[PDB]
Symmetry: C2
């Protein structure tokens, strides 16, 4: 249900995204826009993320989406997250689509970056968090 | 599954109230519970990789921590409302994470994760429970 971004927008990011190339976008969402220090994503909730038989969505999936769009806002090939501070104002319901925006605090020196992430369902702010992303010039395991 | 026997109080599912429907293959499996306490294991799988080098997306560690935190309270209707996490090192495909959670309606839960002897994750998660499903307020 991408009535939230054009097919163009979406293939345009794919061609630009260096981070998490292999991530399962069905669980963490899809990146829908990116720019310097900035990224926008959407998470469509699915029955694979429920906590119960009432449609309640396990909160970690919201975090996963935030984790993904935070890294997309920096867009480095080799990065990880090292810390986070999140608020979950209300849980998602199966059928909801979450809209995330991420803004990286300006810093063209350090490899350690703070990213502010915010999540909405329609007009309601559901989630707010800061995520610390660090990057390296080579892959971490090497 | 050598971290806990098939029955070996792995028949914790008999006692488990929280997250009855959660995908255990993505959030791990609870292997021990008690008042204000829970222990779980996360076996990393190809389904959680961020790249083709075996790097594990960090949120799956959070998912595990999220689950075990809630299992430490073990209420039928609960949700998490806030967290503060540190990820000291990323996991690699093939590692198994061992998590332990200690609870200090709103509760703060200390979660710690190890791979072998090395502490990889630490975090505080706030769990809130209700007499009724949140969706009914």
């Amino acid at each position: 249900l991408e009535e939230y971004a054009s097919a163009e927008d979406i293939s345009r990011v794919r061609a630009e995204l260096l981070t998490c190339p292999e991530l399962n976008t069905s669980l963490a969402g899809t990146i829908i826009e990116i720019d310097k220090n900035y990224a926008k994503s959407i998470l469509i909730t699915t029955s694979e993320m429920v906590a119960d038989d009432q449609g309640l969505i396990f909160d970690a999936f919201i975090f996963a989406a935030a984790n993904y769009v935070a890294q997309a806002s920096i867009n480095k090939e080799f990065s990880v997250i090292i810390g986070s501070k999140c608020f979950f104002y209300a849980p998602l319901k199966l059928g909801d689509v979450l809209e995330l925006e991420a803004h990286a605090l300006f810093d063209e020196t350090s490899k350690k970056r703070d990213v502010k992430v915010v999540g909405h369902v329609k007009e309601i702010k559901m989630f707010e968090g800061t995520i610390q992303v660090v990057s390296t010039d080579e892959h971490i395991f090497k």
